[PDB]
Design a protein around this ligand. Structure first.
Ligand SMILES: [Zn+2]
Lengths: 145, 147, 362, 82, 108, 121, 114, 247
RNA sequence: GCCAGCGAAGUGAGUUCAAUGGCUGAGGUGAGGUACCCCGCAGGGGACCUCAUAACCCAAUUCAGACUACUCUCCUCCGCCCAUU
RNA sequence: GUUUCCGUAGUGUAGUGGUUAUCACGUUCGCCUAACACGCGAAAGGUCCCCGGUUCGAAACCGGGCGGAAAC
């Protein structure tokens, strides 16, 4: 059950790397209508503390990210939507076809909503993101970036 | 989780022995903490007041034991020569004298007080030459063998 | 522990070197040309009541220097700015009044190395390859990125140039107040006023303070003795303490009173009747000091009444990189400075002042 | 009751050499000195640098006590060759 | 003791950069198979003997070493001193650089 | 169903996101496997009772929610008695037994069609 | 004011809290008043276990005394006692010029020639 | 390296409050914060419209540094003595989320332990006035250094009496032998227009306290940065900060 | 499952109201520099100068082993991204 | 050195031999009174000390890290 689910891997191949990244936009279009169906109130004045709290447990698969701070200078400035989301890494695909892996070690990601911009500090958000929606996101420490 | 202390001994050597009868822990704590504020300023007056306390004092003998830290033993032990004019109801002029600066360790601080006490009574034998006092020395030697 | 650090020391260093102007292996020219930032230039000549007219025209022609308000960093990396000032001379840039341990500080080298000092809030947002500069315990707070613009000029379409140019325009806007100056070393002469016509550029002249001090008590020197012979000559260390008091108008005697000034002259000394003072206050090019150093070397072509002259140049308290490698910080003071005690027999003393966290080259 | 280390202070304070391998003979001392060289070389490679003092800067081949295959051949080469 | 030059340091970065090259004789800090010229004359003071049992004594009250020398090392020193004290011979521990003198006396 | 109401949106989003990958580009199914593996894990820890109509397509061996419906083999055959509709993928080679018969349409309407007439608001 | 630390330092065992039977009889009576205020079994033939272990080493008769309270280091021959677990470096010399001492030196072989 | 932060405790009129802003802008101070003293006797919490920074200041602060405007923030300092008053402070986690950095002033060793372990505050005020002895225990300190909690070691002995110079140096040296000096900040509560010193001179008063040979400069720059940033993760949320951008 | 101890002087630190990791100078190793010397293969070595040497933490009868808190450092195994050919 | 126990709305504490978070005090509101102390109903208020692991699901069970408390 452990090695039998891990025969080859669940990892990508060489041929899906060139799948014409603008065709991954309906995956972002599905996520864009998902956020409007989640809170269903955006415009006049509707609780910015609620928006950043519902995105704690929200499955952010297929969302645009842009690195505005990282400990590595080479990681900063990479844009694209994400496909996989592992323990402390998540694989993104960028502009004209090439995929990149950015670890969730000490960095923050910028997620652009319709009328909101939310930073996600990737040093606390780890540990198998299916379990992130479950339990145990408590208040610990600061993020010195 | 524990503090390293330093224990310094002192001795009042003076004439007019009514000054030795006027010794108290309330007066000694008001004497040492004041003369640090007279020599040094308000820095050493409170840096040598958070661990400073009295533990051992005999007015009939004249041995002073004081408490101080590892980081601030050099302020108390340098304020000892500048202690004059113990003001009281009469006219008194005592002055402290150190014997050995002991680094903590109360047991061997009391051991040095024993060897200092034994050397004081042996010299006192021939210099005094009193028949009534020599019998009191024989009471001190006999009771010390019973310990 | 607590009583040791209240009286121990700050870090300071002094390197004293005697040499010859006529020596073929002398580095009196290389140490001044490769010293990048200069603010205070003061020279003294004893027994000089009438200044020579050649030196007086040299003091008034040290600048000028320009000051631009709110200039962004992406303007200094355009190929138009490199081909005008950088490729046809040496252009200098220093962010005015942005301290080296408080905010961001950007500096420019004549070799085309844009070496800038950033804090932690900017080094993580620009995304430029750097390294730590001074350890502040564990939380490293300052970073320095070295960007060589001359190697980017060979391939302007390279991946290194588009990484840096995108990092300043749309990724992180950073405007500063620059102290700009340029040495005219090109065929086509174009002023800086024509290029920066959009922003508020102001042409500034260096402040010149000309004074004459009378009855100065100068020490006795021997050029072949740095440590100082007893009761015959003086130590070179003792003149470096004496020289700052003459420029700071401190020349007094012994006054036993309520206000005793315990500042004695270094003995043995000599009563000197006249002493000429000068203070050139502004952003000084080091190439102008090289014409000033060689004029003071040619000051002893004729037999003069002065035994030795003075050339002391004080740098900024805000310079990131001086002496081509030394990252000058700011730990409760500390400034970089060098000195020239030029004698009549083409010998000079090189007294380099080192600050708190700073190193020294030969 | 002591042990082998107490059996080692039995001879070094009595000014007699130890019987296992401290005296150099052909069949016995060459095997124990090599076994002695295998223990401290393991301890030398165990410690990382900037913690131990270097031995090229200070002295000679040490604490490995086998140059006497050539040391006794050297002191006869100093005298008999002149 | 005046320190000695170490020309074997240049072969260490030659060895480390070759080991990482071939991936993508262990002579590191004091081992080499060249012991011939050093036994002749290497140190400042001429070394002649070793110490096998090196410890401080609880019997005498000071440092008492025990080791082995050669005859030609002794009789070269003994021929140089027919005068006063003869067993005053310095020793040098390998972890230090400080020569310390002892008293040679063969008690048989 | 106050705090658990948010959890229903996180399960059907990753279920639908695996369909959007295979609708545009088939024969590269690594995104459909991970979106089903995350869907099963959230339902495993945050306990929800999903319907057997969708769950019989997830192919509970490791993960494949749409792969047996358009690539693998789903046929009808008769093993011993009544006929069975065997759903078998081509990755873990597991099968799921489902019998199709007109004699048990009353029991075939028992798990799925009884909640269509009884689950009232 | 502790009874458990009044004992001499050679006679200190850290198992005085689990079982009380590691204490003397007169010191146990006070510890019974202090008790109000304050892994599996082994069933194997240990003789046949040590018989199998003797095939490798030499395993002297007094090995069960020495290995229980000494640091056992294998050497050119067999494993023998080298250093005590209690610190007794100054105590062995003090028990040699004034007091008494004895060792176990059984590795010294003998060759009888008739 | 955000340098020269403060914690001022003074409000009675806008004539004295604006004078402290212009005086701090003169020497070296880029970010100036204002505390609000709340006692347990009055039980009053004016949180709604206390200061009105943009309304009651004349639009242009000028420092001699980068010539950047002063980030004038409003902090809170609560004098806490009883455990029956801290329950109101624990109720402020959802009722009124203002006063970006919240500081607490404990008086009890049973209350000092919950403030460093259980209570969610940003900094802890340790000041000793008029013979207040207090033991410093190591388990409430060793958790606070990893949690991110700092300590406002507020000094103001030169206002009224020279005897207050003793109780500031005594309580600080009790902390430095125990806390080891990981995150301890110093600041001056100034009510008079001349009670503030330059930040190049403040760094020796922390070296008068000891605390390092070099991190005493970082006790006003680096440790004040980590103490101000602890109030930002407490304000909005601890992991995700969502900001509304309207160009 | 159950059953076995000795109040007696003095631990290569042996304190117990609880000693001891000190300073200065010279080195080692790890960065940086040379108007200095020697060997002559552009190279290398030596000499000299500046700087880092810590964090976690404290013996209380001792030892072996597991677990946990760690970086001035060295060894092994790799990942991600940048740039080059 | 030694042993056992404990961490639960604001406090004091239950409870659970694993799938639900609550009783007493106090606050708010309501019952009541011309306006009240009691009685009584109801609501606001949760990092169930922290992480990992087991299990379909740990306030719980296990492991580790702290913390706190009772006494020689
Ligand atoms: Zn399958």
């Amino acid at each position: 059950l452990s090695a039998r689910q891990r025969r080859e891997l669940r990892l990508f191949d060489i041929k899906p790397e060139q799948q014409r990244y603008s065709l991954f936009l309906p995956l972002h279009e599905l996520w864009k209508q998902y956020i409007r169906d989640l809170c269903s109130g955006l415009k006049p004045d509707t609780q910015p503390q609620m928006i950043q709290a519902k995105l704690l447990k929200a499955d952010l698969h297929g969302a645009i990210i842009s690195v505005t701070k990282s400990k590595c200078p080479s990681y900063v400035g990479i844009t694209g939507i994400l496909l996989q989301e592992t323990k402390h890494i998540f694989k993104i695909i960028t502009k004209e076809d090439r995929l990149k892996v950015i670890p969730k070690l000490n960095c923050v990601f910028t997620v652009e909503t319709d009328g909101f911009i939310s930073y996600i500090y990737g040093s606390k958000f780890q540990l198998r993101s299916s379990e992130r929606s479950a339990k145990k996101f408590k208040a610990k420490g600061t993020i010195d970036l | 989780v524990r503090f390293k202390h330093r224990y310094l001994l002192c001795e009042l050597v003076s004439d007019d022995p009514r000054c030795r009868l006027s010794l108290d822990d309330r007066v000694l704590s008001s004497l040492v903490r004041d003369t640090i504020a007279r020599v040094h300023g308000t820095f050493g007056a409170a840096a040598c007041s958070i661990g400073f306390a009295v533990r051992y004092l005999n007015a009939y003998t004249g041995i002073v034991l004081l408490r101080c830290r590892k980081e601030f033993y050099q302020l108390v032990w340098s304020a000892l020569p500048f202690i004059t004019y113990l003001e009281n109801k009469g006219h008194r002029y005592p002055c402290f004298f150190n014997t050995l600066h002991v680094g903590g360790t109360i047991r061997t601080c009391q051991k040095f007080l024993i060897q200092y006490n034994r050397r004081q009574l042996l010299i006192l034998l021939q210099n005094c030459t009193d028949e009534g006092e020599r019998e009191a020395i024989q009471k001190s030697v006999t009771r010390s063998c019973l310990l | 522990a607590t009583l040791r650090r209240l009286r121990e020391a700050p870090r300071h260093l002094l390197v004293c070197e005697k040499s010859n102007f006529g020596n073929h292996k002398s580095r009196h020219r290389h140490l001044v040309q490769t010293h990048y930032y200069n603010y205070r230039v003061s020279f003294l000549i004893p027994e000089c009541g009438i200044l020579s007219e050649e030196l007086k025209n040299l003091v008034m022609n040290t600048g000028p220097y320009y000051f631009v308000k709110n200039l962004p960093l992406h303007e200094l990396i355009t190929p138009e700015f490199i081909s005008t000032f950088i490729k046809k001379g040496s252009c200098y840039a220093l962010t005015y009044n942005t301290h080296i341990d408080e905010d961001n500080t950007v500096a420019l080298l004549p070799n085309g190395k844009l070496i800038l000092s950033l804090d932690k809030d900017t080094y993580e947002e620009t995304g430029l390859q750097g390294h730590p500069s001074q350890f502040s315990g564990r939380k490293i707070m300052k970073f320095i990125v070295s960007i060589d613009l001359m190697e980017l000029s060979l391939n302007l379409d390279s991946k290194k140039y588009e990484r840096i140019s995108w990092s300043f325009k749309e990724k992180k806007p950073l405007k500063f107040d620059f102290l700009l100056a340029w040495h005219k070393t090109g065929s086509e002469e174009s002023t800086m006023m024509s290029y920066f016509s959009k922003y508020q550029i102001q042409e500034h002249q260096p402040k010149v303070a000309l004074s004459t001090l009378r009855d100065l008590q100068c020490p006795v020197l021997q050029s072949s003795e740095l440590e100082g012979t007893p009761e015959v000559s003086c130590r070179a260390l003792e003149l470096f303490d004496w020289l700052g008091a003459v420029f700071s108008n401190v020349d007094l005697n012994n006054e036993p009173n309520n206000f005793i000034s315990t500042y004695c002259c270094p003995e043995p000394s000599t009563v000197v009747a006249k002493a000429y003072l000068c203070t050139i206050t502004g952003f000084i090019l080091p190439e102008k000091i090289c014409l000033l150093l060689e004029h003071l070397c040619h000051y002893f072509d004729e037999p003069k009444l002065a035994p030795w002259v003075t050339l002391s140049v004080q740098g900024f308290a805000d310079s990131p990189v001086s002496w081509e490698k030394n990252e000058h910080g700011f730990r409760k003071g500390g400034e970089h400075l060098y000195n020239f005690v030029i004698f009549n027999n083409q010998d000079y003393w090189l007294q380099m002042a080192v600050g708190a966290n700073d190193h020294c080259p030969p | 009751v002591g042990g082998l280390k107490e059996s080692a202070v039995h001879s070094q304070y009595k000014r007699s050499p130890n019987v296992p391998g401290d005296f150099p003979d052909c069949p016995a001392g060459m095997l124990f000195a090599e076994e002695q060289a295998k223990n401290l070389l393991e301890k030398y490679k165990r410690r990382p640098p900037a913690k131990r003092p270097n031995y090229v800067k200070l002295g000679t081949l040490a604490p490995f006590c086998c140059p006497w295959e050539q040391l006794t051949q050297d002191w006869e080469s100093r005298v008999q060759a002149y | 003791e005046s320190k000695h030059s170490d020309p074997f340091r240049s072969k260490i970065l030659k060895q480390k950069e070759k080991k990482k090259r071939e991936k993508r004789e262990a002579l590191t800090l004091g081992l080499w198979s060249g012991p011939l010229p050093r036994v002749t004359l290497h140190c400042s003071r001429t070394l002649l003997g070793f110490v096998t049992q090196g410890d401080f004594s609880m019997a005498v009250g000071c440092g008492e070493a025990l080791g082995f020398v050669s005859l030609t090392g002794l009789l070269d020193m003994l021929s140089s001193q027919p005068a006063a004290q003869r067993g005053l011979v310095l020793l040098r521990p390998p972890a230090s650089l400080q020569y310390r003198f002892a008293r040679i006396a063969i008690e048989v | 169903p106050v705090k658990d109401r948010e959890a229903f949106q996180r399960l059907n989003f990753l279920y639908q996101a695996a369909h959007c990958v295979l609708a545009q580009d088939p024969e590269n199914q690594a995104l459909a496997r991970f979106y089903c593996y995350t869907e099963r894990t959230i339902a495993k820890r945050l306990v929800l009772r999903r319907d057997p109509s969708v769950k019989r397509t997830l192919c509970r061996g490791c993960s494949s929610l749409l792969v047996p419906g358009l690539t693998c083999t789903q046929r009808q055959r008769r093993c011993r008695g009544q006929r069975w509709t065997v759903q078998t993928c081509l990755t873990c080679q597991r099968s799921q037994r489902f019998l199709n018969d007109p004699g048990h349409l009353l029991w075939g309407d028992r798990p799925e069609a009884q909640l269509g007439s009884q689950a009232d608001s | 004011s502790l009874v458990f630390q009044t004992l001499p330092r050679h006679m200190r065992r850290r198992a005085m809290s689990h079982n009380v039977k590691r204490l003397p009889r007169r010191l146990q009576e006070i510890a019974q008043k202090e008790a109000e205020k304050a892994a599996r079994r082994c069933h194997m033939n240990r003789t046949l276990e040590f018989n199998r272990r003797q095939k490798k080493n030499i395993w002297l008769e007094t090995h069960i005394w020495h290995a229980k309270r000494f640091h056992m280091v294998k050497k050119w021959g067999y494993c023998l006692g080298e250093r005590p677990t209690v610190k007794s470096h100054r105590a062995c010399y003090r028990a040699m010029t004034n007091r008494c001492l004895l060792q176990d030196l059984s590795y010294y072989c003998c060759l009888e020639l008739k | 390296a955000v340098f020269a932060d403060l914690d001022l405790r003074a409000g009675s009129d806008l004539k004295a409050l604006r004078g402290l802003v212009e005086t701090a802008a003169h020497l070296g101070y880029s970010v100036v914060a204002i505390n609000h003293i709340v006692d347990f006797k009055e039980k009053k919490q004016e949180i709604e419209k206390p200061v009105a920074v943009s309304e009651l200041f004349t639009t242009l602060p000028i420092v001699q540094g980068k010539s950047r405007p002063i980030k004038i923030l409003t902090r809170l300092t609560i004098i806490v003595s009883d455990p029956s008053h801290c329950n109101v402070l624990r109720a402020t986690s959802s009722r009124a989320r203002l006063y970006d950095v919240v500081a607490v002033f404990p008086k009890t060793e049973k209350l000092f332990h919950i403030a460093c372990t259980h209570l969610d505050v940003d900094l802890v005020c340790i000041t000793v006035t008029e013979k207040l002895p207090f033991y410093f225990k190591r388990p409430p300190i060793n958790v606070a250094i990893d949690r991110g909690l700092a300590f406002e070691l507020v000094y103001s002995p030169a206002i009224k009496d020279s005897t207050m110079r003793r109780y500031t140096i005594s309580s600080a040296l009790n902390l430095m032998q125990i806390c080891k000096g990981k995150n301890v900040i110093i600041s001056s509560a100034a009510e008079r227009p001349l009670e503030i010193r330059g930040p190049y001179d403040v760094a020796n008063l922390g070296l008068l306290f000891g605390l390092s040979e070099s991190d005493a400069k970082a006790a006003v720059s680096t440790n004040c940065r980590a103490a101000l940033l602890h109030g930002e993760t407490r304000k909005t949320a601890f992991g995700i900060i969502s900001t509304v951008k309207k160009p």
